[model samples]
Every structure is written in C-alpha cells, then in structure tokens.
Target: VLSEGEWQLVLHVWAKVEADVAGHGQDILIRLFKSHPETLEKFDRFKHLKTEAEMKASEDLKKHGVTVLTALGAILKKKGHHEAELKPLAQSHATKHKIPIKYLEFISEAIIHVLHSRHPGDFGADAQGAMNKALELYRKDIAAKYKELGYQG
Candidate 1:
C-alpha cells in the first residue's frame, strides 16, 4: 500500500508529468537510444532513427513514445492497483513487440532521470522509495503475465 504521504507524492509530481506526455516520452527514448544504441535494434520502427533530429522528426518513434506516456498517465489516474490495467500492454509488449523484461529497468531509469530533472527537490528519499516499490511491482507483474502466456520476457 502507498502510504498517505507516498500517494500525495505520486499525485503531486504526476500533475506536471501529465501535461506533456509526448515530450517526456520523447526525451526518454532519445536518452535511451543515445546511451545504449544497441537497444534500438529491437524496434524496427525506431532502428533507422539515428540522429537526434531524425528521432525527433520520426513520427513513428514519437507515436510509440506518446503511446507509452499516455498509457502510463492513464494507469496513474487511478490511485493504486494496476495489474489488470497494465496486463494487456505487457502481453503486447512481450509477445508482439518482443521487448524484454530487462528493458523495463531502462524505462525506470529514464523516468527517474525525468523526475530528477523536472521535479527536483519534490522527490526525496520518501518519494524515491514509493516510486521504486511501485516500479518493482509493475515490472514483476509484467514478467509474471508474460510467463503465464508462455512468452519469455
């Protein structure tokens, strides 16, 4: 359970985050692809977008990124409990997208980077703890559902 304070932390930062889902998502992908170039090999659509300008210009990349951020925003709309809400996305990501569960860690990293730069002082140890536990639960749930479907993460 998210402590009362923890829930407040989520809602507070989330307010700013929800405003520019597209840009936030775009930043995440840009950082991820730039830092670990090989990860792009997994996405046929994003494979060709090499330069930062190319990535920013590529509607395909932006679309997927926007999709993720928008869905995350939707999930965050509810106070807590998201396994059922996220299951279908996990199944698609695992099966059709063929994305590894390991990449989920990168997503968490990118989000932390975003929060650190954007929210700064608002996310201290207490907020960090809440997000860490939340991300872990999300990752584990996705992996569990993927396995249940006979799909390897």
Candidate 2:
C-alpha cells in the first residue's frame, strides 16, 4: 500500500533503527503498555512486569520485542507483501493469544512514538506517513484474519 517514494523513505528510516532492533522494539512495547496498561494482561510473559524497570530488565521482554521488530523487518524486506507472515501471526493472536484488534492500533502508535523520539530529524512527516501506511496494511490483514477466524470484539 506504499507508494514507491514512501517505501524508500520507510526503508531509509528502518535501516538506521534496525541496528538496535531489540531496543527499539522494547521501547515500543513499553510505550504500548504505558499508554494502555490493560494490554499487559494479553501478554502472559509481560503481565508480571508491573513497573517500567521490571519491563526493561526482563529478558522475556527483550526476546519478544526482538520478535516484533524482526517480523516487521521481514515484512519491510518484502515491501509490504506480508500475507504469508501475518496470516499465522493473526491466527496465533486470535486463537491462542486472543488479543483484541484495538491493541494493534496501540502498537502502531507506540512504534510511531518510538521512531519519532529516537530519530526526530530523519523520521520526518513523510517517513511517519509511510510507516503508518505500512502498519495500517498489516493491521488490516490481521483484522481480516481475525474476522475469518470468528474472533469477536
């Protein structure tokens, strides 16, 4: 769903940030939890981390956060062609994890927040839009799976 220019901008920014994929992903997860504390309930591995320090210190958080960023990296390499990757992800989240659809939005917001804070100069308006579009497409893909899987609310 990204235009050619938008795709390039996204790649440009992600290339720089991917150097510390785990760290950036952790920041995004932390932001998501900070913005919606209830989301911690969805992640059994993270639910016990009631404080920022605990969340930051947890190896489980780092591993999961790396997974998050790595998935995004894989999708970005495919230039938003993520159906193969996202389908199983949606299935797992819907059937196994039972995560709500709105949490996807929160995660996207958290990603943007982390990107902006870390690279305010390079992650300009266009880059932000491109990143949002990338996440939007993936979120829609996952939402469709949730619907087909009969996931409610």
Candidate 3:
C-alpha cells in the first residue's frame, strides 16, 4: 500500500507520533466528534458525553484511543501486509460492532487532521500525501471487509 519513499516518510512521521500515541489517538477521536457531531452517537460509551470537555474527561475514551493508536502503530511497524493486520479487526467491527462503512473515511481524515496539527513541520505536504495514501488503503481494506460481511453505509 505504501511505496518505499512513502514508507520512509510514514516511518519518519510515526517516530514523532510514538511518544504521544494515546494523546494523538484521543485527539483524533475528538476531532471526529467535533467535526461530525452525529458520529458521536456511534459509540455507546461516548454518546452521552455532551461536551468536548466531558469526552476528554472519559477514561474509557482515552483507553479506547490508546487501543486504536496502539493497533495502528503495530500496523505501521509491519511496513507492509496491513491487510493481514486489518482483516480480523475489520470483520469484527463490521459484523459485531456494525460500524458504518463511511466512518472509515471519517476516522482516517480525523487521524490525519490530528497528526498534521500536532506536527506541523513534519506532517507537511509530502508527509500528508504519504499518510493520505496509507490511510486510504486502510479505509479500503476495512470497507472490503464490511462488504464481505454484508454491511453497508
């Protein structure tokens, strides 16, 4: 899913992201909810949080963010074979969680938004392009799984 140069760029940006992976993950979710408030309803634990402060204060949200970013870090470390990493989780999210397929794009966009804001210089045009490609591939992998599971937006 990533070219050699793009992989290098992803690695470079990911190194910067490693230290605060949890924070960044939470921020990504926060950005998602803020940008598309209705999406908050998707999470049972988070749906009742009426304010950004309330969401930020939830330990469950923080833990879920950590879980998300930790999985992403593992996927990035694999360098390739992301589908191998994504497949089971995608299937589970589709069949069990019943996530809307379009949320894949929303989450990917929110991730880049958080990453770019956190590391302005590092996540520049080239890095953004690299990250965009990587995330698009991720979205496709998840979407594919969703379709296989007979789930749709």
Best by lDDT: 2
Model 3 pairs in collision: none
Model 1 misplaced regions, further than 4 Å: none
Kindly give the number of clashing pairs for every candidate: 0, 0, 0
Better of 2 and 3 by lDDT: 2
Per-residue CA lDDT of candidate 1, range 1-153, in tens?
Answer: 667777778777777777887777788888888776777888887898768999888888888888888787666655567866898888898778877877888878877777767777877777777776677777888898888888886
Q: Candidate 3 — which residues are off by over 4 angstroms?
A: none
Return the TM-score for each candidate structure: 0.89, 0.95, 0.93
**For residues 1-153, could you state the per-residue lDDT of candidate 2 as single tens digits?**
689999998888998788898899889999999998989888876788888888899999989999989888888778877789888889988999888879899988999999999998879999999999998988888988999999974
For residue 138, model 2's alpha carbon misses the true position, in angstroms, by: 0.8
lDDT of 3 at 25: 75
Q: What is the lDDT of candidate 1?
A: 0.78
lDDT of 3 by residue, 1-153 (tens): 588999889889999888887788779999999898878888887898888788889999999999988888788777778778888889888887777767778888898898888998989999999988887877777887888878885
RMSD of 1: 1.7
Q: Rank the candidates by TM-score, best first.
A: 2, 3, 1
